[PDB]
Design a protein around this ligand. Structure first.
Ligand SMILES: *C\C=C(C)/C=C/C=C(C)/C=C/C1=C(C)CCCC1(C)C
Ligand SMILES: CCCCCCCC/C=C\CCCCCCCC(=O)O
Ligand SMILES: CCCCCCCC/C=C\CCCCCCCC(=O)O
Ligand SMILES: CCCCCCCC/C=C\CCCCCCCC(=O)O
Ligand SMILES: CCCCCCCC/C=C\CCCCCCCC(=O)O
Ligand SMILES: CCCCCCCC/C=C\CCCCCCCC(=O)O
Ligand SMILES: [Cl-]
Ligand SMILES: [Cl-]
Length: 264
């Protein structure tokens, strides 16, 4: 049902995809350890943001590693190419884990924006509904990514609509809660917002790929468009969100955040 099943792969194509995915496990897991060690310098009020990023890292990784084992499971070198065998490869769990990588993500954004209580719960609720709603509409079209391209174009459209609409919630909360933010990070939070738009349009670029490049190199470009997406929405919003918590902790008088910044 997915263009990946349609082709045989050069050895260079199959190896590049497999190193891509593996570089992936490597980075989500190495960043996994950074995210743990530095959590002891984040003040109690922000320390979950730090934590939330370990879930991101270990969702991702576990499922990224899943994809690379399935890639080698699915294909075997036969008469001069990698041909599809008895098991299949697909990108379902990405998505299926898109569906949960994000709650925790906008959650640790919302933490460092200093929201608390009811605005925090309420904002997170609407956000999860609409991201989730981007995530799932987009899931029903890549399902048609071979059979019915106008169903890619139509589900695409609707997911996008959901994407447009959700960057408004986040936009608004950021520009409205900038002023709350400590130790200089009111400037910083505007970068993460932008940082954040780039990686997430990579994925619609990553979706119209059957529509505009249905061949084996397109399969490759998807996955490339996949590994970067991931170093940014997961690994580098990751970090950037983390700096903000530590800086705000120092600004609010938390001595291990103060000493941590001082050391460097
Ligand atoms: C791993 C983390 C994140 C934040 C992934 C977010 C995904 C998007 C912004 C994807 C959007 C889609 C749309 C807008 C277009 C058609 C179908 C998609 C699911 C690829
Ligand atoms: C075997 C997997 C292939 C890649 C090996 C990965 C291990 C080294 C990767 C680089 C570290 C990831 C980025 C930096 C971690 C955050 C710590 C920091 O920025 O101070
Ligand atoms: C292999 C990784 C072993 C654990 C290393 C990271 C643990 C840091 C200890 C801590 O910060 O409490
Ligand atoms: C949330 C769901 C919102 C409803 C929009 C419906 C989108 C169109 C479905 C495509 C079905 C079809 O093309 O047959
Ligand atoms: C911003 C995220 C950083 C992601 C780094 C991903 C690294 C990709 C590395 C360089 C691409 C060079 C590709 C050469 C591939 C040719 C493929 C082929 O064999 O046909
Ligand atoms: C070419 C690569 C350009 C840089 C890409 C990797 C950057 C890592 C992001 C780390 C987040 C640092 C927060 C900013 C700190 C500050 O305000 O000075
Ligand atoms: Cl605190
Ligand atoms: Cl994922």
């Amino acid at each position: 049902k997915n263009i990946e099943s349609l082709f045989d792969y050069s050895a260079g194509q199959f190896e590049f995809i497999d190193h891509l995915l593996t570089m992936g496990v490597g980075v989500h897991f190495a960043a996994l350890i950074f995210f743990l060690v530095v959590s002891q310098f984040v003040a109690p009020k922000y320390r979950i943001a730090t934590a939330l990023s370990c879930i991101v890292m270990v969702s991702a990784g576990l499922i990224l590693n899943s994809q690379a084992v399935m890639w080698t499971d699915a294909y075997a070198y036969v008469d001069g190419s990698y041909q599809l065998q008895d098991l299949t490869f697909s990108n379902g769990y990405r998505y299926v884990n898109w569906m949960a990588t994000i709650p925790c993500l906008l959650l640790q954004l919302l933490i460092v924006l200093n929201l608390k209580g009811k605005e925090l719960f309420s904002t997170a609720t609407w956000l999860i509904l609409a991201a989730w709603g981007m995530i799932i509409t987009g899931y029903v079209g890549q399902l048609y990514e071979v059979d019915d391209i106008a169903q890619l174009m139509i589900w695409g459209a609707v997911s996008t609509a959901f994407f447009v609409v959700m960057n408004w919630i986040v936009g608004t909360k950021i520009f409205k809660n900038r002023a709350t933010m400590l130790g200089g990070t009111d400037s910083t939070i505007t970068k993460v917002f932008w940082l954040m738009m780039f990686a997430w349009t990579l994925y619609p670029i990553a979706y119209l790929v059957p529509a505009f490049m249905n061949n084996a190199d397109g399969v490759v470009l998807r996955q490339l468009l996949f590994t970067i997406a991931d170093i940014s929405s997961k690994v580098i919003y990751g970090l950037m969100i983390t700096y903000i918590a530590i800086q705000q902790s120092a600004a609010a008088g938390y001595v291990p955040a103060q000493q941590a910044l001082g050391r460097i």
